[PDB]
């Protein structure tokens, strides 16, 4: 067949044309699949071997079944990632190879109960949750510093302020630092079609601060498309799991202390102001250190000024080069 070769050449010729073009958008994949084993890919052998919780960068549009994307990993080449509908088609393909998929068990019962496939045996049912396989996440993951105690107080603000200035000086002319005052942990997507569409409704959520929450999320989305590195100074974040289910899912950077004895003497050097709230600062470190380390993106166990700074420097630099 010449049509398959021609469409292979035409699609391939378009590939290098978009190699040096700006990134359009980006989503996240929470399922394990390979784009090279599939026989419906326009180009065979140039698929993507991605895994669960990965990132991709779409740049153009091809069809309703395939998309052109670049891996977030360093050295990412041109690859094809299945469309949300295409992934659904192969999603049904994975659990249809089994002997049965609906109610009728094959426990030595053949020829009696045919059990034609009902509505409950297809993907249109099970609409209790309906988690989307692809989530609209920012193209570049925002970096957030968390710990070691309550945010907005003397202890946490200043031990994170230094790292903001240290990163700003080295990334000057290419980075943007923004502080958000509105709550960000309430970044939900599947609560209602449009909660508080207008501010003049005078409803329960019209006069509350829920409306201000969403307005910042689209700004984060638009700031993500600017291609410039952005870090968040949100004071409403204290636990990684609070801001983990949301679409943004910022980079959780953990600062930890070797022993609580160091923490107790730390406030003692501050003064009489922070001893009153010292009771809750001890709890905050304890309820944050009991969280498993693997949830956190990175860890900062070093105590010195320099080794704590440059350790995160190469991590962000390798990510910066990996995106492009």
């Amino acid at each position: 067949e010449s049509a398959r070769r021609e469409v292979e050449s035409q699609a391939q010729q378009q590939l290098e044309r978009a190699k040096h073009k700006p990134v359009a958008f980006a989503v996240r994949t929470n399922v394990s699949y390979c784009g090279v084993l599939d026989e419906e890919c326009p180009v065979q052998g140039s698929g993507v071997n991605f895994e669960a919780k990965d990132f991709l960068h779409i740049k153009e549009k091809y069809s309703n079944d395939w998309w052109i994307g670049r891996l977030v990993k360093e050295g990412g080449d041109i690859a094809f990632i299945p469309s949300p509908q295409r992934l659904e088609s192969i999603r049904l393909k994975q659990e249809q190879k089994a002997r049965r998929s609906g109610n009728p068990s094959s426990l030595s019962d053949i020829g009696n109960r045919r059990s034609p496939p009902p509505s409950l045996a297809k993907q249109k049912q099970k609409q209790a949750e309906h988690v989307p396989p692809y989530d609209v996440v920012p193209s570049m993951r925002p970096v957030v510093l968390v710990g070691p105690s309550l945010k907005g107080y003397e202890v946490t603000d200043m031990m994170q302020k230094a790292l903001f200035d240290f990163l700003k000086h080295r990334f000057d002319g290419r980075i943007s630092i923004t502080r958000v005052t509105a709550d960000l942990s309430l970044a939900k997507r599947s609560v209602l079609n449009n909660p508080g569409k207008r501010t003049i409704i005078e409803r329960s959520s019209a006069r509350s601060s829920i409306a201000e929450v969403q307005s910042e999320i689209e700004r984060i989305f638009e700031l993500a498309k600017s291609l410039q590195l952005v870090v968040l100074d949100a004071d409403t974040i204290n636990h990684p799991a609070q801001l983990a289910k949301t679409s943004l899912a910022p980079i959780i950077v953990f600062v930890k202390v070797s022993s609580p004895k160091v923490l107790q003497r730390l406030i003692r050097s501050r003064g009489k102001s922070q001893m009153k709230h010292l009771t809750v600062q001890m709890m905050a470190y304890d309820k944050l250190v009991q969280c498993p380390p693997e949830s956190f993106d990175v860890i900062l166990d070093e105590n010195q000024l320099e080794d704590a700074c440059e350790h995160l420097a190469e991590y962000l630099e390798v990510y910066w080069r990996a995106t492009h």
């Binding site: 200043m158 230094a162 160091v262 050097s269 501050r270 000024l305």
Partner: peptide, 14 residues
């Protein structure tokens, strides 16, 4: 530890 922890806690703000 307090050598490198008290030096980081001072120059950042004060």
């Amino acid at each position: 530890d307090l050598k490198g922890y008290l030096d980081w806690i001072t120059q950042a703000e004060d």
